[PDB]
PDB file of C-alpha atoms and ligand atoms in Angstrom:
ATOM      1  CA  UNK A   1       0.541 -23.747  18.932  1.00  0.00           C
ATOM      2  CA  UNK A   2       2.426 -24.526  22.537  1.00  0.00           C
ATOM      3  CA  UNK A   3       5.804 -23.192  20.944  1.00  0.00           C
ATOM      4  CA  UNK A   4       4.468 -19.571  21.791  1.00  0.00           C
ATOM      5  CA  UNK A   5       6.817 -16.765  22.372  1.00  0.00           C
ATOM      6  CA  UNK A   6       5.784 -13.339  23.844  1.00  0.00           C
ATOM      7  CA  UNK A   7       7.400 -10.363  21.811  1.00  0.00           C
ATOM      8  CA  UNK A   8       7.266  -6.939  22.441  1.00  0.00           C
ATOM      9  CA  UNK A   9       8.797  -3.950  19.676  1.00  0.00           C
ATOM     10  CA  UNK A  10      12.247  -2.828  20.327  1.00  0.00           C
ATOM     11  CA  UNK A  11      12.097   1.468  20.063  1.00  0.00           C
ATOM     12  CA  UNK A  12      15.995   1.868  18.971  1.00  0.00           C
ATOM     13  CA  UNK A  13      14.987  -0.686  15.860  1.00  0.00           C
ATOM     14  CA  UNK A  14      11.594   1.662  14.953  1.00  0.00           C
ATOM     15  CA  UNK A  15      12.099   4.064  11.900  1.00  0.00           C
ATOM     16  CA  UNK A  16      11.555   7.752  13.641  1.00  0.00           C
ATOM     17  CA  UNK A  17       7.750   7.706  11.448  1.00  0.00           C
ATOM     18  CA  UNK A  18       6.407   4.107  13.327  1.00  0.00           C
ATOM     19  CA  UNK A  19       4.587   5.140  16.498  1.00  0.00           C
ATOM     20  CA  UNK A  20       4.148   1.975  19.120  1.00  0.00           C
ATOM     21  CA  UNK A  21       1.455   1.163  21.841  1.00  0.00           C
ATOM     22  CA  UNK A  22       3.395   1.981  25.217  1.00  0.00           C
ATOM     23  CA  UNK A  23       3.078  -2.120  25.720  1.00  0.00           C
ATOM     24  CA  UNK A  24       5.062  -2.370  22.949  1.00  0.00           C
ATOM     25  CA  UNK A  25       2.629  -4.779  20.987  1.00  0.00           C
ATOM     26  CA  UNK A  26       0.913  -2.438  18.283  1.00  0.00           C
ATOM     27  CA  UNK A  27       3.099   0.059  15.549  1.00  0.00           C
ATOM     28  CA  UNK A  28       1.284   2.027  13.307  1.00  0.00           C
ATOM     29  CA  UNK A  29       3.106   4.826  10.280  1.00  0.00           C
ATOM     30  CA  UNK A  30       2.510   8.205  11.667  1.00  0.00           C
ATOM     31  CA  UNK A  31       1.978  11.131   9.574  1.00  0.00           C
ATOM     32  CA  UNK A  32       5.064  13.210  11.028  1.00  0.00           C
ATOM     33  CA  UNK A  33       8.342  12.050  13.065  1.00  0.00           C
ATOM     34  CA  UNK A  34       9.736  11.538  15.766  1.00  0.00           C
ATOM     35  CA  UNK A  35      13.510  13.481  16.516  1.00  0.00           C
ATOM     36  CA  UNK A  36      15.355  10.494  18.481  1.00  0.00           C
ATOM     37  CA  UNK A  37      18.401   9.509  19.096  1.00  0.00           C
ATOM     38  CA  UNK A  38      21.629   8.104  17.103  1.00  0.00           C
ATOM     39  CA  UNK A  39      21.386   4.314  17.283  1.00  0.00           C
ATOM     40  CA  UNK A  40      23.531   2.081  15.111  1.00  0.00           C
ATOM     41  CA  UNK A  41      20.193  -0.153  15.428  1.00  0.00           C
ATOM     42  CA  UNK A  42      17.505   2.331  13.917  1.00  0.00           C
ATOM     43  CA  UNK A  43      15.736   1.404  10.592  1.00  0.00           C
ATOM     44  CA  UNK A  44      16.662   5.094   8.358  1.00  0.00           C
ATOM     45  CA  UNK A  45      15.387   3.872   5.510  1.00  0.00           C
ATOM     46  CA  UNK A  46      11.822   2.306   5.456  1.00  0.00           C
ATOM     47  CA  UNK A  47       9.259   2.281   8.320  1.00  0.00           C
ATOM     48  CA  UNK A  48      10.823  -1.540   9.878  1.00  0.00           C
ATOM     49  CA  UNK A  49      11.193  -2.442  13.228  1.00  0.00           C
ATOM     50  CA  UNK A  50      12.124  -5.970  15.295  1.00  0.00           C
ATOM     51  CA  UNK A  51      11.538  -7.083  18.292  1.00  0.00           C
ATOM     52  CA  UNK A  52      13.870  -7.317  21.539  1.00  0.00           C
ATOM     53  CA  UNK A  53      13.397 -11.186  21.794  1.00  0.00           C
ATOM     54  CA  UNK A  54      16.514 -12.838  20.625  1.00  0.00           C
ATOM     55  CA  UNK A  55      16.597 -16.212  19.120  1.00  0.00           C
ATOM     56  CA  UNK A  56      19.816 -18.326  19.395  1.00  0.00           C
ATOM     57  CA  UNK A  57      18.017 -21.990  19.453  1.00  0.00           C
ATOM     58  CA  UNK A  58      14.411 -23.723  20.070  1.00  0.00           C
ATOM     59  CA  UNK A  59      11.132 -23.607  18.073  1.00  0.00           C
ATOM     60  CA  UNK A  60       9.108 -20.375  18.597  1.00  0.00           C
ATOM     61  CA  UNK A  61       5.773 -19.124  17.213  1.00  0.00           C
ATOM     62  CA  UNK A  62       3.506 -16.120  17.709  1.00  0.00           C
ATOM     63  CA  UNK A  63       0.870 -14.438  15.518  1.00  0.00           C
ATOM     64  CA  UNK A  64      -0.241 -10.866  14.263  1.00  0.00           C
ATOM     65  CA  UNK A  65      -3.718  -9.194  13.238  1.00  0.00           C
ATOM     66  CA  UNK A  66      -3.734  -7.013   9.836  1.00  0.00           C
ATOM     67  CA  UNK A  67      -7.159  -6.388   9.931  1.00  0.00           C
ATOM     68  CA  UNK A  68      -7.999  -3.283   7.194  1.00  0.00           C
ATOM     69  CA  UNK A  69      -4.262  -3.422   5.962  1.00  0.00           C
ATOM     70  CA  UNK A  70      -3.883  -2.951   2.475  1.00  0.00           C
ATOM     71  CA  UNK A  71      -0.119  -3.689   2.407  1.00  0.00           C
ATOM     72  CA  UNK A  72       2.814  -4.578   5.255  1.00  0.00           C
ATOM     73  CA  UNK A  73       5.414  -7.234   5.693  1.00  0.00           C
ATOM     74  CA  UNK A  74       6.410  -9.722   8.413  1.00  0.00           C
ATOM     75  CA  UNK A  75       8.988 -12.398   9.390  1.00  0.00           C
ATOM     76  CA  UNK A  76      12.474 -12.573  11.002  1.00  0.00           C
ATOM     77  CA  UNK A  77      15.565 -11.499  10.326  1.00  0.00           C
ATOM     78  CA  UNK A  78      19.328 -11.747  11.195  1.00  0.00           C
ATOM     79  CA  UNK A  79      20.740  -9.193  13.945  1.00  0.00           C
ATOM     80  CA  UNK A  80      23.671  -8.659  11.448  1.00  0.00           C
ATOM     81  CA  UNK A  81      21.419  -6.966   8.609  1.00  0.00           C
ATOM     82  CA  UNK A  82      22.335  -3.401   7.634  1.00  0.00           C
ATOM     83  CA  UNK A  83      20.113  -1.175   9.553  1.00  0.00           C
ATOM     84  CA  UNK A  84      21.473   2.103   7.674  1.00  0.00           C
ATOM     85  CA  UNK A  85      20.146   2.775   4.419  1.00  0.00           C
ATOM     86  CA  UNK A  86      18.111   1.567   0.625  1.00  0.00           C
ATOM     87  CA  UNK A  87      18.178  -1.720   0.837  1.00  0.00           C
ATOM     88  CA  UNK A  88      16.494  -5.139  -1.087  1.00  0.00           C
ATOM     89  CA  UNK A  89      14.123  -6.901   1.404  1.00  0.00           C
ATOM     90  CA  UNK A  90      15.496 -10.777   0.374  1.00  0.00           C
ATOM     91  CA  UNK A  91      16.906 -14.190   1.613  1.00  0.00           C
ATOM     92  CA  UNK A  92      19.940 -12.754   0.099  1.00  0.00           C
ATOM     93  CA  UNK A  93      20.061  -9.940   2.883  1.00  0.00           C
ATOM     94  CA  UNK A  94      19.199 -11.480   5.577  1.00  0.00           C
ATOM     95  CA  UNK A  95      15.256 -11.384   6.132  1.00  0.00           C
ATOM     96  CA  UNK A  96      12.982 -14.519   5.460  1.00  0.00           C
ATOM     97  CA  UNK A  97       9.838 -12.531   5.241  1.00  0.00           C
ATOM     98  CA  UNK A  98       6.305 -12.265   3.474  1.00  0.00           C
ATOM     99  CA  UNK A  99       4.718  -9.547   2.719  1.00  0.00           C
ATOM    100  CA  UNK A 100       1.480  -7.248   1.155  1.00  0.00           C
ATOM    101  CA  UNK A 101       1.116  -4.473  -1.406  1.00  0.00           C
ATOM    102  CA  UNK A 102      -1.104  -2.745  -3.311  1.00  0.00           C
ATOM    103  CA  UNK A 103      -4.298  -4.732  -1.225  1.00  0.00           C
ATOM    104  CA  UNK A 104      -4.544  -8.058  -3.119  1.00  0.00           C
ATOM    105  CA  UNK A 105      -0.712  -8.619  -3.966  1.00  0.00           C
ATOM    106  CA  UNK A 106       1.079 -11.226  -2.033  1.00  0.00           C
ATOM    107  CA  UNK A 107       4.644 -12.119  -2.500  1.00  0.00           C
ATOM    108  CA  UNK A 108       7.615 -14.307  -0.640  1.00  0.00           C
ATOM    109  CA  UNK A 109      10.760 -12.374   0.048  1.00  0.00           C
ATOM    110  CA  UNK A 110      12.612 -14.939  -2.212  1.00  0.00           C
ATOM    111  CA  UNK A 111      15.483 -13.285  -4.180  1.00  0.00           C
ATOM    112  CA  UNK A 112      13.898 -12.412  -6.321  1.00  0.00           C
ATOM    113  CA  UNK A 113      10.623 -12.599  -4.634  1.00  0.00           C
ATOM    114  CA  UNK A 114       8.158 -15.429  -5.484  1.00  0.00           C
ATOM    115  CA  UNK A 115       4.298 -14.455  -6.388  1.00  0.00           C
ATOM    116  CA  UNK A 116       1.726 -16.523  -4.140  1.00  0.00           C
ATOM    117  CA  UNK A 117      -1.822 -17.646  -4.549  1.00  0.00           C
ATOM    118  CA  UNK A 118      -3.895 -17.265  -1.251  1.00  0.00           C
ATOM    119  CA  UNK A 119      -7.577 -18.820  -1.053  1.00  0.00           C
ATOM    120  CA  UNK A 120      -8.322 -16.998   1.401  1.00  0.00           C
ATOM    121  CA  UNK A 121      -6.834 -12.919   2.205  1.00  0.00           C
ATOM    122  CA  UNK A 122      -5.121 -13.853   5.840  1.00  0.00           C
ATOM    123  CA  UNK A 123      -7.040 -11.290   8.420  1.00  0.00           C
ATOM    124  CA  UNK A 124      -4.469 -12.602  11.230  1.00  0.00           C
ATOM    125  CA  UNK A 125      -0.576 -13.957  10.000  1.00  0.00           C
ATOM    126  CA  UNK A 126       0.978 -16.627  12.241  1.00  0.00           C
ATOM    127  CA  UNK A 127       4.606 -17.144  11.931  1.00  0.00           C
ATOM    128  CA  UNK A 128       7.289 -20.305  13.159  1.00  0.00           C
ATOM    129  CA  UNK A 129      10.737 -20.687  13.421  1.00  0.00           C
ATOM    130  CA  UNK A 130      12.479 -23.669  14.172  1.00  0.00           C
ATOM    131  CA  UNK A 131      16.597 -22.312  14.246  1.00  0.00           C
ATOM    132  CA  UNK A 132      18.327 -26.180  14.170  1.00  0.00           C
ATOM    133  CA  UNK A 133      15.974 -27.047  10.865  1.00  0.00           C
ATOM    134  CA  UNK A 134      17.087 -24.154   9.043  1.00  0.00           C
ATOM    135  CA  UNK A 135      13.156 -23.805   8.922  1.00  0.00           C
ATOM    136  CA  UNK A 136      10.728 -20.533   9.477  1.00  0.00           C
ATOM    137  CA  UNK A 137       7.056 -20.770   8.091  1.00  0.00           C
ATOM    138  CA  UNK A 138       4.340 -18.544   7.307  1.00  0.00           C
ATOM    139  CA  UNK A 139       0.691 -19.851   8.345  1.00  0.00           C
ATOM    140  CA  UNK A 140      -2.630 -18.321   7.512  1.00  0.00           C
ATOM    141  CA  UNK A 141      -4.609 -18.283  10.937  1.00  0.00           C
ATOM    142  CA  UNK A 142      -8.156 -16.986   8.653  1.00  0.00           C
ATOM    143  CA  UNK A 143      -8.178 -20.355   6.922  1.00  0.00           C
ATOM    144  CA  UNK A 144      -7.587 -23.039   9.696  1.00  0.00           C
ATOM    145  CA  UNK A 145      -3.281 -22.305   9.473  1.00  0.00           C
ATOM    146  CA  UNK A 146      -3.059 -23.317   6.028  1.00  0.00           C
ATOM    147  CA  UNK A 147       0.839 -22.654   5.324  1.00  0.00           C
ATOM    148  CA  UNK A 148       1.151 -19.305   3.168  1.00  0.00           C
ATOM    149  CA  UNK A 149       4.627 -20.212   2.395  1.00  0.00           C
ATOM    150  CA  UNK A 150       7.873 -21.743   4.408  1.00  0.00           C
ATOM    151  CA  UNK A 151      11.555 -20.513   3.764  1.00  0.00           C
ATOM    152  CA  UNK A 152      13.493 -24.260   3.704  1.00  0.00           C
ATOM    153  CA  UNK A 153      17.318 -24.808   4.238  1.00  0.00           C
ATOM    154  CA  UNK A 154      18.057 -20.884   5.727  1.00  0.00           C
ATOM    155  CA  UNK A 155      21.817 -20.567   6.888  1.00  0.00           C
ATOM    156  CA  UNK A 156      20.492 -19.489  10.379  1.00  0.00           C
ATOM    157  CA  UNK A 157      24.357 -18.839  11.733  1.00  0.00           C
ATOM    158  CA  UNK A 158      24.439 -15.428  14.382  1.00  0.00           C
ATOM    159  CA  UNK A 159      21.083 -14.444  16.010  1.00  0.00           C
ATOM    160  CA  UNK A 160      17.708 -13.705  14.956  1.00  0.00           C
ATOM    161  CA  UNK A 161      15.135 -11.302  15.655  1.00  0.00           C
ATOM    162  CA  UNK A 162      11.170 -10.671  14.757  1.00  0.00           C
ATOM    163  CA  UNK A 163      11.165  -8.428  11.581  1.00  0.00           C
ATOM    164  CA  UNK A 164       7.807  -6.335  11.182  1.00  0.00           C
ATOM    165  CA  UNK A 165       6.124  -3.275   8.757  1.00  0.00           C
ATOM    166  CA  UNK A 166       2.987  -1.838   8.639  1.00  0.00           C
ATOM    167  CA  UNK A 167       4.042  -0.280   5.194  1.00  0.00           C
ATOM    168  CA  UNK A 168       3.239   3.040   3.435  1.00  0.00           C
ATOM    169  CA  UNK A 169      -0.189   5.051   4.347  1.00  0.00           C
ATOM    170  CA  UNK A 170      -0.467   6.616   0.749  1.00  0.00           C
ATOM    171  CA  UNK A 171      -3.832   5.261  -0.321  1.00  0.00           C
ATOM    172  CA  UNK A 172      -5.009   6.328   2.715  1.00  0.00           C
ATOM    173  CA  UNK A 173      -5.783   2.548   4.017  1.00  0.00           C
ATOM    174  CA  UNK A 174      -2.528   1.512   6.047  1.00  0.00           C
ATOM    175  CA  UNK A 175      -3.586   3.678   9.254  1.00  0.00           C
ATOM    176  CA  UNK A 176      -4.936  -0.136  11.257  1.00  0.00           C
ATOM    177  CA  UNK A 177      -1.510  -1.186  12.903  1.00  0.00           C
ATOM    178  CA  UNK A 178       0.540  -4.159  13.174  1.00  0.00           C
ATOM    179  CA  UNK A 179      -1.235  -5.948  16.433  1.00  0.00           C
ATOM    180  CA  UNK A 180       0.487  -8.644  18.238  1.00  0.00           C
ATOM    181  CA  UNK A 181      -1.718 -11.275  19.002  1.00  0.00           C
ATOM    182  CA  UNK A 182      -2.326 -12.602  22.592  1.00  0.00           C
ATOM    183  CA  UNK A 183      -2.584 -16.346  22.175  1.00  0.00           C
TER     184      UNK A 183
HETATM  185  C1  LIG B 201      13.191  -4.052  -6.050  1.00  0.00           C
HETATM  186  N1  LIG B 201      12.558  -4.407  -4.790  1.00  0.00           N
HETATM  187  C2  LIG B 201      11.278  -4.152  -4.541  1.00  0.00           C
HETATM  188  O1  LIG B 201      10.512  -3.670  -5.373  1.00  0.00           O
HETATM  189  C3  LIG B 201      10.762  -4.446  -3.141  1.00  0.00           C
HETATM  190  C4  LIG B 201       9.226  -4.450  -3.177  1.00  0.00           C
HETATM  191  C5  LIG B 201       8.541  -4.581  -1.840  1.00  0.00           C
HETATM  192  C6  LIG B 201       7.358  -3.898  -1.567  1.00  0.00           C
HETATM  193  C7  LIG B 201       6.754  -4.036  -0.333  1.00  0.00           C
HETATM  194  N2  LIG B 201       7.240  -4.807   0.640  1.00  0.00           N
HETATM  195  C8  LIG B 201       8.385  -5.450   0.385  1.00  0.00           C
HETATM  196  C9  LIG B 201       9.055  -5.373  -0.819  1.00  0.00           C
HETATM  197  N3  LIG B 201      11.290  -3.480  -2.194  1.00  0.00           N
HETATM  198  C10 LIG B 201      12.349  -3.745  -1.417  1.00  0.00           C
HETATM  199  O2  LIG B 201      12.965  -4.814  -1.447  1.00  0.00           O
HETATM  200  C11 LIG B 201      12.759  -2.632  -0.444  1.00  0.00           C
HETATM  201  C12 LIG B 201      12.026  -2.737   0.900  1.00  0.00           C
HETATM  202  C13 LIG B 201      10.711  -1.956   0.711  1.00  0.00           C
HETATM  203  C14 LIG B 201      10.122  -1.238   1.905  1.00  0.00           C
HETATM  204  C15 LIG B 201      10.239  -2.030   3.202  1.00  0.00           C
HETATM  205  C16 LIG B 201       8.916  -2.646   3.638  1.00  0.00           C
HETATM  206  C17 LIG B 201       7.840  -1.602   3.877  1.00  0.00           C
HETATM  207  C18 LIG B 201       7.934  -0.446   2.907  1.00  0.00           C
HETATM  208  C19 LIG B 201       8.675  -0.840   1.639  1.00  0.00           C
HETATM  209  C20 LIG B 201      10.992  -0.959  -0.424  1.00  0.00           C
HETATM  210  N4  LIG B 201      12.346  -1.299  -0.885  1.00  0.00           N
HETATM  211  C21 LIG B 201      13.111  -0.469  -1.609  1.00  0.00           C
HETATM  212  O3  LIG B 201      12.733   0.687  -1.776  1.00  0.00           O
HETATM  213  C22 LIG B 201      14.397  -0.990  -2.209  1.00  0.00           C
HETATM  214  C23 LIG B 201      14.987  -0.192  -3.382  1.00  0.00           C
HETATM  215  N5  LIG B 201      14.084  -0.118  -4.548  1.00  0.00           N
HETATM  216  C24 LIG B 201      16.326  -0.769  -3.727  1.00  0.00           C
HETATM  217  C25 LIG B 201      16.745  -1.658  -4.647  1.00  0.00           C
HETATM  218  C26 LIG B 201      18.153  -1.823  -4.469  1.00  0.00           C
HETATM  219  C27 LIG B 201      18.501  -1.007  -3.425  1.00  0.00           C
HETATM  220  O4  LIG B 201      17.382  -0.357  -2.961  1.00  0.00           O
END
């Protein structure tokens, strides 16, 4: 779409075990970690990270390649969500995600979460926001942006940023990273 929106990885959102192209436009889960600083804005928990761009209006889009990626999970989320500590990934937090487990497993970060039934696995994601509607969207690039799912009637109140995982590496297929697509 012409709504694109350029986004690049913020590194004091990245949990210490996500390494990141130096253009800030890939993250992958790295075997060890990374000894940091102490940011009020680092992900302990899981391996999530956001991206600097800040949304306080307009319509915005932009898309992501998962290519070879068994599991991950993207979307956006409020600035105000917890970054410290366990949470559940939900509406109810403050993330209006999808997301990928366990290779042919597809769920909406409803609470609870919502199954969903995909013709066609998405090798790229795209995702849309539109802040005054209350609206952010989920479109499957693979299979001519057929809508994966849309979150409807979100309280969209402080700001918003880009929420993104590549998830866990423990079958041994979720090395491929999170690419950001040009456009
Ligand atoms: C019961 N909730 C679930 O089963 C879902 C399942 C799920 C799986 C994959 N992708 C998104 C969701 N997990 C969560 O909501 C969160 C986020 C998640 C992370 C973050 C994305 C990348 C890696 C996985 C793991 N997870 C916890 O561990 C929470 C924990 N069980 C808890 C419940 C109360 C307080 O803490």
């Amino acid at each position: 779409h012409h709504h694109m929106v350029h986004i690049t990885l913020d590194p004091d959102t990245a949990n210490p075990w996500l390494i990141l192209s130096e253009d800030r436009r890939q993250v992958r889960l790295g075997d060890t970690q990374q000894s940091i600083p102490g940011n009020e804005e680092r992900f302990d928990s899981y391996p999530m990270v956001l991206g600097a761009q800040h949304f306080h209006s307009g319509k915005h889009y932009w898309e992501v390649d998962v290519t070879g990626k068994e599991a991950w999970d993207l979307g956006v989320c409020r600035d105000s969500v917890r970054r410290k500590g366990h949470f559940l990934l939900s509406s109810k937090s403050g993330f209006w995600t999808i997301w990928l487990w366990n290779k042919q497993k597809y769920e909406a970060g409803t609470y609870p979460q919502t199954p969903l039934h995909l013709q066609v696995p998405p090798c790229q994601v795209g995702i849309f926001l539109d802040y005054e509607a209350g609206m952010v969207s989920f479109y499957n690039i693979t299979d001519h942006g057929s809508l994966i799912y849309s979150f409807s009637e979100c309280a969209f109140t402080g700001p918003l940023r880009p929420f993104f995982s590549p998830g866990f590496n423990d079958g041994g297929k979720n090395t491929a990273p999170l690419t950001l697509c040009p456009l």
